[PDB]
């Protein structure tokens, strides 16, 4: 009694999770870009 | 002898089958993005036999679908369409030369 319990959020734990989520997000975006790049190249097969 | 069948050979039935195959291949390409659509294959040997005198084949996917259910491998469809067009062009040349040779003999020109 006479005290209030705050939150247990570990600020560093969230920040290091953020930077890893950013890098993994960006790497998958590159996978999307190289997927359409391959698709565009494999379109001259029907380009007689 | 001296008949159009014995003269043209199987180059008249083959052309029809090659156009049939192109219709099937083009259908798979168009229906690539439709979920639940299963890729359709065509047996050339059976179709040629049926054409000479006169069932559904599905293509096994190389990899699982991403959830939609469509088993159309657009990389393979383009390759087969390119091959079908080349062999169809040869069949037209083969069949076209049958008529030219027949006309050449009946006129001596």
Residues 65-94 of B with CB under 8 A from A: 74-75, 78-79, 81-82, 85
* Alpha-carbon distance values, B64 to B4, B19, B69, B70 (Å): 49, 30, 8, 9
Size of interface A-B (CB pairs under 8 A): 13
Q: Do A45 and B78 touch (CB under 8 A)?
A: yes
Task: Tell me what percent of chain B is helix, strand and coil, each rounded to the nearest 5.
Answer: 60, 5, 35
Among B52, B39, B38, B42, residue whose Cα is nearest residue B83: B42
Q: Structure resolution in Å?
A: 3.5
CA distance A13 to A16: 6
> HSE (CB half, 13 Å, CA atoms) of B40?
16
CA distance B43 to B17: 10
DSSP string, B52-71: H----EEPPPSS--SSS---
Q: For residue A42, what are the contacts with CB-CB under 8 A and spacing of at least 6?
A: B75, B78
The approach used to solve this structure was cryo-EM
Distance of CA B68 to the CA centre of its chain: 28
**Tokens read off for B81:** 């369409």
């Amino acid at each position: 009694t006479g005290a209030i319990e705050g939150s247990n959020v570990n600020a560093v734990g969230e920040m290091t999770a953020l930077i890893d989520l950013q890098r993994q997000f960006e790497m998958q975006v590159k996978m999307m870009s190289t997927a359409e790049e391959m698709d565009k190249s494999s379109d001259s097969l029907l380009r007689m | 002898a001296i008949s159009f069948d014995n003269a043209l050979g199987i180059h008249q039935h083959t052309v029809g089958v090659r156009e049939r195959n192109a219709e099937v291949i083009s259908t798979n390409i168009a229906q690539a993005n439709t979920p639940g659509y299963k890729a359709r294959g065509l047996d050339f040997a059976k179709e040629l036999q049926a054409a000479t005198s006169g069932d559904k084949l599905y293509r096994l996917p190389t990899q699982p679908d991403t959830g939609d259910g469509n088993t159309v491998d657009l990389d393979l469809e383009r390759n087969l369409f390119m091959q079908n067009q080349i062999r169809h062009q040869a069949s037209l040349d083969f069949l076209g030369s049958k008529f030219k040779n027949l006309t050449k003999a009946i006129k001596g020109e």
